[PDB]
Design a protein around this ligand. Structure first.
Ligand code: CPS
Ligand code: ADP
Ligand code: ADP
Ligand code: MG
Ligand code: MG
Ligand code: MG
Ligand code: MG
Lengths: 371, 370
């Protein structure tokens, strides 16, 4: 049985393929930076408590698949190994985590075009529109992600909507939280959204595409950390990303929000064009080119995306796993206020998801609720 | 793997430990074994190629079904993947329902039974009844790529275009062509196929037509779940309802009433059974929020109807026909009823989300087939 947790030294496997430091943000994952004194490398390895190290196989394979379609939008992987639960990948230390960058006031003018093309291509080319069902059904097996899905199933879709252990919210927030716990019609909709997440095996999704999962500079965008990858609903990554743009918007004031709104607008438009051009060129489906079918498919993805976004908005505000955008808002009272707005916009997104005709409708409703 | 014969079949039976005679009776080989001094079936998959792995699916699927509705599926005594054999209870004392129904048997309990079959099989293998972690494992073991590929092609694709596998009377061409030129129906057919391709909700039977049921006045056994996989809850429901309708189309006037009552009753029973199971046995913290079960039922219903429309069309002009329609006489009356199968099927797909109840479904049908 050949699994051994790495150190700085054992990490410099690198040779078997001058200085090293562990730089990991988590505690579930080690991240080793290696630099030859002018040339650098990353070695990521899954630690076990509980949560198996099989995630490393998922993450590794998923980056590889993503690389076959959008190599410019994800780090190159040089080597990986299941038993050791290691992924050896490109260093991106010359870039900034998009969430950290956004909180600091960077605007990243190309973030939405890039993320948009990422979503369109990754989401299209792993679905039944792009692949023979026989082949696609095999990939569902290899990407079955029970333990990481269970995290999302609980935290994104469940726990925040009831009085559960894992929730974490200010007492000042209680009354609004309670208003959500008492809201049957929203909960029903969230259940529907969960059930889609549980059963809708449409494409190989990234499964955790928030702003902490992106490296960015003025001119480049890299999507990292697809360890939640499995076959899920097409609109989930779309929704989760959008929600995080809005989460940042809530941490800004007045005119400074405009870039985030423009990014929400652009990521959708670009996702739609990208998905569309790929549908046109590379669908295997005899139905693909009947006028109206693509359009209805995009309506359904769009409605799901908004519902999922609602869930992320709420879930990041009062659930186990928070975002810096909200948690570092200051002073206290302003934090609570913006946190209330995340609940309220989230709630609106879930309930009104099927009424929106365009992304602009979404932006405009948000603008209105956060005055 | 060795393909069996009358003798090696007997030997297997004796070697597993269960004055013998054997005949192959398959409509896949099916070996009937009888002790003159008690009976047994041994079904084996032959290698259209098409792997023998189906026999592993079928076998495991009868076992799962047996854990919840043992009275509605044959007992399985033994099975083996490598040999692709399933050894099961003999039901020769019963009639295939489709044959029975064409002869004029009414089977008064068929819908109650199949209703409870669907309610329980379809509930107890979904995320509502099982931990997702567990459920996702079953999805792996029931992945059915080759048998799914048959259905994806024959039920949801080929009939709707001018493809190889289609098979229909020339007299029927004009109505066929009307369907092929119908963009809006085809879009709906696409959506239904996409649900069939992606919606891994439960372990479905996958081929629950009237030729996959043994029946007598008092008993009902569902056989042949070799198409089993994780798909949409409403598909078996739809496919069964459609086959009741297909029989209706082969009857005239008053004699249709039992088929309509069956459509009505199977849905009623499916609803009540699924509902009682949800009440008792859901794991879902959402399960009891008033309105959620109802909405779920509406979506199952809506899909059921869409799938049924596909089965109506597909059985009329695709590769694999049903005796109900093909044996109608005279010719001209066949064509006429075959046109109604097209037109009711088309209605079911397009109007699927408009129907308030099963009665609305029956009533629309009755209207079109006057
Ligand atoms: C007021 C702004 C326009 C500002 C602007 O365009 N600048 C807009 C454009 C999109 C609009 C929403 C959607 O249509 C969905 C939905 C339809 C229902 O029927 C009524 C409610 C709701 C939430 C609509 C409200 C309002 O109408 C919105 C927010
Ligand atoms: N390819 C890389 N290049 C440079 N730094 C990286 C790279 N991958 C991860 N890191 C650093 O290590 C941290 C952990 O990576 P991440 O994939 O977010 O781990 P986790 O899945 O544990 O959240 C990142 O936030 C980043 O700061
Ligand atoms: N358990 C059984 N008891 C009695 N006869 C059976 C049994 N299973 C199959 N048969 C006979 O053999 C035929 C083939 O059964 P079926 O499961 O439909 O095979 P296939 O999957 O090839 O269609 C049936 O129509 C039936 O007449
Ligand atoms: Mg990360
Ligand atoms: Mg991670
Ligand atoms: Mg059969
Ligand atoms: Mg069969």
């Amino acid at each position: 049985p050949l699994y051994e947790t790495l150190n700085e030294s054992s990490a410099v496997l690198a040779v078997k393929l001058l200085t090293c430091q562990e730089i990991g943000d988590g505690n579930l994952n080690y991240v080793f930076h290696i630099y030859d004194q002018d040339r650098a490398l990353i070695i990521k390895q899954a630690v076990p408590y509980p949560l198996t190290i099989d995630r490393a196989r998922i993450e590794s394979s998923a980056l590889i698949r993503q690389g076959e379609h959008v190599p410019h939008l994800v780090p190159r992987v040089f080597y990986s190994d299941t038993e050791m639960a290691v992924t050896v990948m490109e260093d991106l230390s010359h870039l900034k985590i998009a969430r950290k960058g956004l909180i600091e006031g960077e605007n990243y003018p190309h973030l939405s075009q890039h993320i948009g093309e990422f979503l369109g291509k990754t989401l299209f080319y792993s679905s039944d529109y792009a692949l023979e069902p026989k082949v696609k059904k095999q990939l569902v097996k290899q990407f079955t992600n029970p333990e990481l899905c269970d995290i999302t199933e609980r935290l994104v879709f469940t726990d925040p909507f009831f009085d559960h252990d894992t929730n974490d919210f200010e007492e000042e927030l209680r009354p609004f939280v309670e208003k959500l716990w008492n809201n049957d019609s929203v909960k029903i909709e969230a259940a529907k959204l969960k059930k889609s997440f549980l059963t809708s095996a449409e494409t190989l999704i990234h499964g955790d595409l928030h702003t902490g999962s992106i490296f960015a500079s003025e001119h480049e965008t890299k999507v990292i950390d697809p360890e939640f990858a499995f076959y899920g609903p097409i609109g989930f990554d779309v929704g989760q990303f959008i929600a995080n743009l809005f989460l940042n918007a809530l941490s800004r004031d007045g005119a400074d929000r405009e870039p985030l709104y423009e990014h929400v607008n652009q990521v959708w438009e670009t996702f739609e064009e990208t998905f569309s051009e790929a549908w046109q060129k590379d669908s295997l489906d005899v139905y693909a080119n009947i006028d109206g079918y693509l359009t209805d498919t995009l309506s359904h993805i769009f409605e799901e995306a908004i519902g999922f976004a609602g869930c992320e908005l709420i879930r990041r505000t009062i659930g186990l796993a928070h975002v810096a955008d909200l948690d570092t808002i200051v002073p206290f009272d302003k934090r609570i206020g913006r946190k209330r707005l995340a609940l309220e916009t989230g709630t609106a997104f879930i309930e009104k998801r099927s009424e929106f005709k365009t992304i602009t409708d979404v932006i405009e409703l948000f603008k209105l609720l956060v005055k």
